[PDB]
Curated annotation (Swiss-Prot):
Protein's name according to its UniProt entry: NEDD8-like protein RUB1
Subunit structure, interactors included: Forms a thiol ester with the heterodimer AXR1/ECR1, specifically with the 'Cys-215' of ECR1. Interacts with ML3.
Organism: Arabidopsis thaliana
Disulfide bonds: none
Protein's job: Appears to function as a stable post-translational protein modifier. An AMP-RUB1 intermediate is formed by an activating enzyme, distinct from the ubiquitin activating enzyme E1, which is composed of a heterodimer AXR1/ECR1. Auxin response is mediated, at least in part, through modification of the cullin AtCUL1 by the attachment of RUB1 to 'Lys-692'.
Gene name of the record: RUB1
Domain Ubiquitin-like as annotated: residue spans: 1-73
Native organism taxonomy: Eukaryota, Viridiplantae, Streptophyta, Embryophyta, Tracheophyta
Range covered out of full length: 77 to 149 of 156
Domain of life: Eukaryota
Amino acid sequence: MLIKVKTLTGKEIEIDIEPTDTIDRIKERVEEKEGIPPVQQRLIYAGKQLADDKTAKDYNIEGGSVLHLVLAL
Ligand SMILES: [Zn+2]
Ligand SMILES: [Zn+2]
Protein backbone atom coordinates (compact mmCIF):
# COMPACT_ATOMS: atom_id res chain seq x y z
CA MET A 1 0.00 0.00 0.00
CA LEU A 2 1.21 3.39 -1.02
CA ILE A 3 1.39 6.08 1.72
CA LYS A 4 2.52 9.81 1.75
CA VAL A 5 5.11 11.19 4.22
CA LYS A 6 5.01 15.01 4.48
CA THR A 7 8.10 16.93 5.69
CA LEU A 8 8.59 20.34 7.31
CA THR A 9 9.93 21.72 4.09
CA GLY A 10 6.68 20.77 2.42
CA LYS A 11 8.13 17.79 0.56
CA GLU A 12 5.67 14.90 0.00
CA ILE A 13 7.37 11.46 -0.34
CA GLU A 14 5.36 8.55 -1.74
CA ILE A 15 6.50 5.27 -0.12
CA ASP A 16 5.03 1.85 -0.90
CA ILE A 17 5.06 -0.26 2.31
CA GLU A 18 3.72 -3.68 3.55
CA PRO A 19 0.90 -3.65 6.24
CA THR A 20 3.18 -5.99 8.15
CA ASP A 21 6.20 -3.59 8.15
CA THR A 22 7.29 -2.26 11.53
CA ILE A 23 7.49 1.52 11.77
CA ASP A 24 11.30 1.09 11.83
CA ARG A 25 11.10 -0.76 8.45
CA ILE A 26 8.99 2.14 7.09
CA LYS A 27 11.88 4.55 8.11
CA GLU A 28 14.30 2.28 6.30
CA ARG A 29 12.23 2.39 3.07
CA VAL A 30 12.28 6.20 3.57
CA GLU A 31 16.10 5.99 3.82
CA GLU A 32 16.35 3.87 0.62
CA LYS A 33 14.44 6.49 -1.42
CA GLU A 34 15.52 9.76 0.19
CA GLY A 35 18.70 9.01 2.17
CA ILE A 36 17.38 10.31 5.54
CA PRO A 37 18.78 8.04 8.32
CA PRO A 38 16.09 6.17 10.27
CA VAL A 39 17.59 7.41 13.52
CA GLN A 40 16.76 10.97 12.63
CA GLN A 41 13.10 10.38 11.65
CA ARG A 42 10.06 10.88 13.96
CA LEU A 43 6.91 9.73 12.13
CA ILE A 44 3.50 10.99 13.25
CA TYR A 45 0.10 9.58 12.50
CA ALA A 46 -3.24 9.80 14.36
CA GLY A 47 -1.79 12.74 16.23
CA LYS A 48 1.02 10.82 17.91
CA GLN A 49 4.62 9.69 17.36
CA LEU A 50 4.76 6.08 16.07
CA ALA A 51 6.79 3.43 17.95
CA ASP A 52 9.54 1.68 15.93
CA ASP A 53 8.53 -1.73 17.00
CA LYS A 54 4.83 -1.55 16.13
CA THR A 55 3.48 -2.43 12.66
CA ALA A 56 1.60 -0.32 10.10
CA LYS A 57 -1.17 -2.87 10.74
CA ASP A 58 -1.04 -2.06 14.50
CA TYR A 59 -1.80 1.63 13.68
CA ASN A 60 -4.40 0.65 11.12
CA ILE A 61 -2.42 2.67 8.46
CA GLU A 62 -4.13 2.28 5.00
CA GLY A 63 -3.55 3.04 1.32
CA GLY A 64 -3.33 6.83 0.87
CA SER A 65 -2.67 7.51 4.59
CA VAL A 66 -0.57 10.65 5.23
CA LEU A 67 2.16 10.47 7.97
CA HIS A 68 4.12 13.61 9.05
CA LEU A 69 7.89 13.62 9.31
CA VAL A 70 9.77 15.72 11.92
CA LEU A 71 13.60 15.53 12.04
CA ALA A 72 14.94 14.49 15.36
CA LEU A 73 18.51 13.98 16.43
ZN1 LIG B 1 1.78 -1.26 -1.90
ZN1 LIG C 1 -0.35 18.18 7.31
